[PDB]
Design a binder for this molecule. Structure first.
Ligand SMILES: [Cu+2]
Length: 166
């Protein structure tokens, strides 16, 4: 169990630690760490919730629905907080392509992978800090999809992150 705290994930921003910067986020208000589903679950319109019961409100998709963190292209620091550490296989990061439609359901086919970090089947610390590169053809509102792949289960934790790139 874990979430991306910086830049705050869509779920995390629904919690008090995240400033309640997103309203009406279902279970994400209280447990943004709990978006767990089998690996390689990428159902169109169900990326933000990973299809998980009680996280459905996260799947709404419009240009103005969600709070964005202002960022630049180039390096971006990602910080996870893990409420329950688990042996880890992988950390994968995706971002929406230039030209994507922020008023349509999220579809993984409209993202590129932009980073992949091997977990080495070790147990990470409670705070995990990684740096990924945001490609320079992205500007304005984009969604980063951060996926923590568990080493000793068939599951992963899924974190959609709303950013405004300038
Ligand atoms: Cu867990």
């Amino acid at each position: 169990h874990g979430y991306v705290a910086s830049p705050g994930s869509r779920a995390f921003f629904g919690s008090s630690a995240g400033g309640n910067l997103n309203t009406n986020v279902g279970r994400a208000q209280w447990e943004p760490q709990s978006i767990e589903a089998p690996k390689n679950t990428f159902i169109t319109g169900k990326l933000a919730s990973a299809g998980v019961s009680g996280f459905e409100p996260l799947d709404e998709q419009t240009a103005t629905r969600w709070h964005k963190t202002n960022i630049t292209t180039g390096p971006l620091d990602i910080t996870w907080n893990l409420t329950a550490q688990h042996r880890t296989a992988s950390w994968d990061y995706y971002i929406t392509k230039n030209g994507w439609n922020p008023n349509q359901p999220l579809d993984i086919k409209n993202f590129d992978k932009i980073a992949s970090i091997d977990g080495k089947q070790e147990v990470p610390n409670k705070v995990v800090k990684q740096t990924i590169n945001i490609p320079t053809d992205r500007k304005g509102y984009h969604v980063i999809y951060a996926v923590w792949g568990i080493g000793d289960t068939v599951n992963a934790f899924y974190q959609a992150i709303d950013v405004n790139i300038q």
